[PDB]
Structure 1
Amino acid sequence: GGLQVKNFDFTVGKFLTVGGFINNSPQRFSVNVGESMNSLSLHLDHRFNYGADQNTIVMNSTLKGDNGWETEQRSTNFTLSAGQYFEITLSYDINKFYIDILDGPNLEFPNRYSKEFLPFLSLAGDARLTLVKLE
């Protein structure tokens, strides 16, 4: 399940763009990059209507799936909308991830595990992934 795209090596200095459509009436959706669903260098969660979290971006990582979430970094500079097309571009170096949301903010997050190559990508939650671009 999934597609192995042989040509795409998301290494330091490359720009990975993910595009897709957010569901109508969303709770939240995340972009996840790392080694696997359980070992993620970046979990970027856009929470629309999620209890106390209303239009909040939560960023975190985990080495142990759902039982290893570490320190959250949050932002309320929230620019996505339910039912819309979105694009988010990610790049990183040995110190930081650089998150560029199209028509939105640029955010940074630590590269906690000193990764120089990331083999896995998933989108989870209330959205549909339609595009992956690497430049």
Structure 2
Amino acid sequence: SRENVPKRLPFAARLNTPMGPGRTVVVKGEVNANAKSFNVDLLAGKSKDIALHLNPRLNIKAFVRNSFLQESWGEEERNITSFPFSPGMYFEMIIYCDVREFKVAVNGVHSLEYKHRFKELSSIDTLEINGDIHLLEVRSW
């Protein structure tokens, strides 16, 4: 399609346009009633570096973020001011790429910022989604 090409869960897709300031990726889904965890990753398809790993942990109500670069995970980022997911419930997560950071919102509420660690934004071209959700729609504009 116009925005990505899968390459339903686990889900992997090549973004038609790579990331950069102004780019938005939207994941719409329903958390499983018995969910423990799910993951949304933005990857550099070539190097397989993970620029942004997003992991809502339903079992402990934590929202963990990290990057996998030079074949190692970095320092986990965990601070939240609320946990925006709940089992059984529909959600919309917006990943917005800004100049210095990603901005992530859930259900229309700003949730976190993640300072870019992988700096070559135009090399981020792959989206992977897996875990304890029913994936309903992915948008990328």
TM-score computed with the length of structure 2 as normaliser: 0.78
Partner SS, residue 113 of structure 1: coil
1:129/1:24 Cα in 2 relative to 1: closer, same or farther (>3 Å)? same
CA drift at 1:101: 1.1
1:26 aligns to 2:35 (yes or no): yes
Q: 1:47 aligns with which of 42, 47, 57?
A: 57
Equivalent pair of 1:94/1:114 in contact (CA under 8 Å) = no
User: What's the RMSD between the two structures over aligned residues?
Assistant: 2.4
Deviations along 1:38-62, one digit per CA (max 9) or x if unpaired, are: 421111111011xxxx100101010
Structure 2 unaligned regions, length at least 5: 8-12
1:127 aligns to 2:133 (yes or no): yes
Aligned to 1:101: 106
Structure 1 unaligned regions, length at least 5: none
Q: What is the aligned residue count?
A: 129
Partner SS, residue 34 of structure 2: coil
AA aligned to 1:33 is L
Aligned to 2:75: 71
**Which range moves more in the overlay, 54-63 or 72-81?**
72-81
